[PDB]
Amino acid sequence: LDRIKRLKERVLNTRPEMDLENAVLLTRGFKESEGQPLAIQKAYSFRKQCTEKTVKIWDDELIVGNSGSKQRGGLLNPDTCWSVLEDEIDTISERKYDPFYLTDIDRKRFNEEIKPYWKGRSTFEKWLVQIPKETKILRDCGVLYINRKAVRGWGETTAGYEMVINEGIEGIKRRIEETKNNLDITKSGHYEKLAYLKALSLVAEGIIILSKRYAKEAKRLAQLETDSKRKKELEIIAKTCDRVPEKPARTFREALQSLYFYQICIFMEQNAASYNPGRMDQYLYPYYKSDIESGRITKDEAQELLDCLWVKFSEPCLFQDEVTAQFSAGYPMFQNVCVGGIDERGMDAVNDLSFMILQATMDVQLYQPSLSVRYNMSRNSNAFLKKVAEVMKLGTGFPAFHSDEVGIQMMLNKGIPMREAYNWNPCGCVETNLAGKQRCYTSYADYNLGAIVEFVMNNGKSRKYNTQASIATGDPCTFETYNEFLGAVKNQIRYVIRAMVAGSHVNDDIGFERICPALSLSFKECISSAKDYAWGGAKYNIGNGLDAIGVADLVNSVYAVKYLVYDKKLISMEKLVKAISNDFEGYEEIQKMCLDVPKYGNDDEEVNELTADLFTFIADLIESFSGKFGHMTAGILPVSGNTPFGLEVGALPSGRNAFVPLADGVSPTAGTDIEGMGAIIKSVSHIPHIRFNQGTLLNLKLDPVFNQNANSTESLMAFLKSMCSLGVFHVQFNVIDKEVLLDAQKHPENYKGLLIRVAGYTAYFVELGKEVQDDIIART
Template sequence: MIARGFSNPTERIEKLKRVILDATPYVESERAVLVTEAYKETEGLSPILRRAKAAEKIFNNLPVTIRDNELIVGAITKNPRSTEICPEFSFDWVEKEFDTMGSRIADPFQIPKQTAQELHDAFLYWPGKTTSDLATSYMSQEAKDCMGAGVFTVGNYFYGGVGHVSVDYGKILEKGFRGIITEVVEAMEKMDRCDSDYIKKQQFYNAIIITYTAAINFAHRYAEKAMELASAEMNSARKGELLQIARNCSKVPENGATNFYEACQSFWFLQCMLQIESSGHSISPGRFDQYMYPYYKNDPSITKEFAQELIDCIFIKLNDVNKTRDEISAQAFAGYAVFQNLCVGGQDEEGMDATNDVSYMCMETVAHVKLPAPSFSIRVWQGTPDEFMFRACEVTRLGLGVPAMYNDEVIIPALVNRGVTLNDARNYCIIGCVEPQCPHKTEGWHDAAFFNVAKVLEITLNNGKAGNQQLGPVTGDITTFSCIDDFFTAFTKQIKYFVHYLAEADNSVDIAHAERCPLPFLSALVDDCIGRGKSVQEGGAIYNFTGPQAFGVADSGDSMYAIQKNVFEDKTMTLTELKNALDANFGQPVGGKNTLSIDTNEMTTEMKVYEVVKKILSTNGSIDLSKLSDEVLGMGSVQNTCGANEYLKIQGLLNRTPAFGNDIDEVDMMARKCAQIYCKEVEKYTNPRGGQFQAGIYPVSANVLFGKDVAALPDGRLATMPLADGVSPRAGKDVNGPTAAANSVAKLDHFSASNGTLYNQKFLPAALEGDKGLQTFAALVRSFFDHKGMHVQFNVIDKKTLLAAQKDPDKYRDLVVRVAGYSAQFTVLAKEVQDDIISRTEQSF
């Protein structure tokens, strides 16, 4: 037997989990008030020292909260799964949503009136002083117009702090915060006063000392709180736990950990404090099994059961971290996503398999906790043990959307191609959704922008126009094009134009963070900021990248192939007929409302004809034009611009034209080409930190949100409907089975998309049952990776369950699904995101 099942979680874990599931997310005001006070008190200091003084005030004054049953302590907020506000990055969107944030369609947060008043008072200080304000002042009007039209957005760092990083957790476990202070003092002693950067370096080093001294005090405040609670605790067992917590917090993270429990507490304090310093999300634990294993292996006093419970507690604490965004961004990140990616398995720096006991314990924890966070990932290579692979597939069968699986055989050479050393590339971890980087040596600026490739195609089809606005360059009336190369020539020119302004916008935000919000606490844990005497925002990291990601690749490839097949090869329609059909949204109302639900009296003649054609096609699969007039007798003329001929041809696009995801080379190569055009253009640019732009292809859930900005496309997609997610085929288009779909995805140039690619597959649970199902499933993953796919993740759930959860959400509050590069509780997702997940093809072997 291969399958072995999972043990049951402890009663403590069930209670802690219930706190998360039952929590109502709140916006809290303490951090905003404290950071505002600090900035008012430090008007004359340099930006780096102001940041240090702000962190000092927050660490010394943020409320200390220890929740019932906790073994690992440390919280950002008083209420579970709530959020603080960081007005130094942006604030005005918060005030605009005081009355609506609690009822919006995606990720609502409650804001009590007293909290709103405290935030309002703090916000009075910030107009003109935020990173967002400064970044906006650097952007050209053209870049702002591109964002306004839905071509791209840089909202991730535009509105929040810089995240998407994995710091040196192992260094803190070994040396503690005191070790950081000692390292900085030694660096200061070596400084040359004649160095032109002496003053800036001195300021940076002083900022680290101030910040880390306050961070030590933050942990000591928890030790005092635990002692206070212990003195009043009547239950002897809990009293003993609180006393041990007090001992842990008085020791770590100030000093290095000496056992596994201390290492777990030290890890969590560091993770918590990184979130407190800035509002950046995707602060990723990285290769947790690698830096935690020595403390488990060398701890003679710990039992496997208690170590397992501690890891379970850490995973639950990761779900306590939350973040609010503006209403539009919340739709793109639907599901209270914070993207703390924790990765296990893979190779070590010498190219040997690195799987260990903690790797397996983390998978056991996923089965115990069954919550969205962390974004749990595994690394796979040719040397991955079969036992590890089967265990990962067992976890996948639980239906939680994890683990996401990554291919060492693609990612390592892709990173080496970007200038990362082989040893560092072998040590890569995953950041945020799907982004690979060398941990604690990289400022990757992953997820730097969403770029809507399908929107650029729409603009290409309209000679550079978005609606009535001439947004891009004039590249020609498509009805005059004579071959598909004409389309690609025009499309490439549009891509070049819009990528230029994407890079400008990203660099504007990048510069603003360096000038106004350098992060000393984070920077001290990224190599080689201390050695170089500068923050990560100023280029202190060894590797510096900017990673904007695209989506709409499959839609664009399918559309190009549809034009090639139907116009130039089969000649079943003219470009004029296609253009008219696109402009008319194939006769459907914009918004995708099904015309069958519209009263007949409200339907136009064209809509009635469309429905008749659609019914005939759905029944017969084809139609005899000579009989069409009988079917539509009494409906009026059908030979107008948007008449029966156009509708029939568009139905051919929808029903007969092959699509990406079916292992058909001529189709798949179209998608590959569309992706390559974007990736190659992106990598031409550099950032202010001295690094290169590198492209990714993944959407979070922006394929739903930004699909609303895209008109009808030649692949038959209606205006405003969701786009394909990541490198996945369009929902329902991959009809030749999971292997064919995976083969299509593997044909994309994943090496060029070194900022990460994202592939979702959805399986019926019955397909993976038993040992045979497990073996077949593992073989599918191995085959996909042998064909040079980069990443794959799975939803294992049936449509019936998802529809039931939509209908009765209270019964399914613990239902977790994979959205994109993250999992989320299904019932908290906006309905349109739920619908997108439901619509994905259900695969079976």
């Protein structure tokens, strides 16, 4: 009860503004270490950053740090995406989606030493000039969205946090000296491996530096402190910050500062989405246990710490251009923390600490510990399960729920063995990865299945921009049979993904040379290889993944043609084309028999079957292709692109008006699930989950009049078990009066800190663009 430090309303009354500080340090680091090998002049100016960076502790903190200079700041990395800002230099402040304030004077810095150095030298700039011909058109004609991962650094991986807590930069330096001593600059390949290893030495040094300046500030705050209490907490914030990364953790306090200290450095250098701290309930437990039975911490002192950490997680803002924001509104960092599941010996893995990590989200209720669960029905206690469901019906959006039994073989289906794959941890939205051991763009680019449907009915040409976007599959009125049809729908899938594999292959080669680290500092192999995450170095290198969006709309559109055209012969294609071309202006009798046909989600065998055929094909299709890091992977997750992808697709044989959102993930189109919620699951069980080893996403919008009877809890639980027992991968819930959302678009102000599940993550309703707000509204 007495943890009344919600005095971190500081974070809600804060405004997003660019933070071009670090961008200036980096500029200076580069200029003085020119001629160095790029990993050395990157890592030498990282030390510069944390040596000459703001250092600030805010008025009530027990855990400290911040990747920038401001709270809710937008971090520019000019080495990767400088020109994003030079473009929107005088709009970004007032843009509709995800805006940032660019102060009067930060903008002097930008075109005075940031812009005149970096002009023509960035990752993103190389991507704009090299994206392949066919890929580039499809991107333009609205068919897929590749530019996101050329502005946002690596991300989408859970780093080697457990080592930094357990060895500290002290013990990692030994690993560095071990493999440096085994090399010989006389010997063929060794200079590159020795030179990189130096960069790993600067960055270890830079973290050290930073963490001690932090304690230093905490002594300064002490020796001016009136409050007996808040003085004696400052002194322990220094006693910690002095040990923390340099040496191994020894207390609960000292683990959480190890962790988050490292967390912000990795986000310092690149700013990517989805740096997931991972199985936090598993490697912190030994510290929690021994501190309980010693007095150094009491359970309530624990959950205070956590609730602070959770407010620090809610602190930064993911930086993106004008448009990628539309495709992922809400500043989301996607920092996945997960509890529960299975042990290295196959036994339940859930301790007191799994519940208190669920607990701190019921308490703080900010958006940025992306909570998650690995529920192992045959291992995790019903007691665990209850606490999960109680969380959910806070309408919080949290936590996303994964069926542990599915997530394991997804990781086996990736080539990892059960000896290490039990540790899989949700990553970002719903992706999979593995702590310290997997490089992998778990979601390189999205592809618009709505556009495709619109392509086969239009024989390649784009309705809206009137160009020959895709290949010419022939016009739809010479398909004698249904298979002639399906044939052309596959051919159209095949043309798009090719282009994506080109683009992936191109940006792999850009990330290679030019986008190095010291995140890699926490991958054991990267150290003994003398080889970076970007280059190889990771234990298991996995091909990039390609997320599809428009599931509901493929199935419904294709089956609508099998029904009405090829064996119920009610409409000739001739006329269908006419109907959708015109948005059903005159033709609004057709739009009717379409939304009469079985829909994906009500669970009609004829549909579930086609749903299986298509996507086993889409899987075989991708695993065909290989880059330098293994064969490609796929998933189904939209983030928020289902809405703006919707705006480029015409009307479709599914009964969908033109320019509406596309479906979201593997959920149905809004207004087609007139059967149950238990038949929502069953229609989606036929999606082959373990073939899409990078994740699957389900959205469901519960009405809040449910938390009433004293079984809503007992009954939500049992439904979670249906999901798992059917072999479905993931489900997550909203629990909200429409009444509230509707008012909040009216008066955005008296609804601060109100949450919603968008897809994979959680945003503040008021801070999203109106389009996506409707999309979320219209869900049943």
